[PDB]
């Protein structure tokens, strides 16, 4: 699922992941590289920047918690099996 967003300074931003609800992490497409913690207030539509080590950490723990989400595993297994079952 692609989602883009315009920063007023750094222009177009691309979605890394969610934080989640009700915030998403975004990164600079034209610069390499800056990260933003976006949310809708919503007067509004805010932006607050975070360093890469923070961002890297936030993605990690999302990455962990996602691995043990039902729908993710449910898909990842259906994948492993689908071929031998039908194909």
């Amino acid at each position: 699922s692609e989602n883009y967003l315009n920063h007023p300074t750094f222009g177009l931003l691309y979605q890394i992941c969610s934080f989640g609800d009700s915030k998403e992490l975004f990164a600079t497409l034209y610069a390499q590289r800056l990260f933003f913690l976006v949310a809708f207030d919503a007067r509004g539509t805010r932006f607050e920047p975070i360093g890469r080590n923070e961002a890297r950490m936030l993605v990690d723990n999302r990455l962990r918690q996602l691995r043990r989400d039902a729908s993710l595993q449910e898909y990842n297994q259906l994948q492993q099996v689908f071929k031998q079952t039908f194909l």
Binding site: E2, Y4, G11, L12, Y14, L29, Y30
Partner: protein, 108 residues
């Protein structure tokens, strides 16, 4: 001498840029466009109401190259930019009579 316009998925910029830089294609310019149109899969929400989107965020790479290099540059971009499923985009090749550099005045 010819111009390659490549409409691609925005997140693929870096992968493309690298490929082009490895082909020693240093002079590229990028603009933000929207492409048409179906396309398919579109039907979403944002939070009451829910909506459909006909024009999807894409990026337009413009680079100019020698006639010999075209075939290569094309193949490299394709490899870099493609992702199997629909919405990958398209590439337009068109002619260019001359290029001039503003800093120096050098005509190619």
């Amino acid at each position: 001498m010819k111009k390659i316009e490549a409409i691609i998925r925005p997140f693929k910029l870096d992968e493309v840029k690298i490929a082009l830089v490895n082909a020693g294609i240093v002079g590229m310019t990028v603009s933000e466009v929207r492409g048409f149109g179906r396309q398919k899969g579109q039907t979403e929400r944002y939070r009451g109401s829910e909506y459909t989107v006909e024009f999807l965020q894409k990026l337009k790479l413009e680079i100019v190259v020698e006639d010999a290099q075209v075939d290569t540059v094309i193949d490299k971009i394709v490899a870099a930019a493609r992702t199997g499923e629909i919405g990958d985009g398209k590439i337009f090749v068109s002619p260019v009579d001359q290029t001039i550099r503003i800093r120096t005045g050098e005509k190619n």
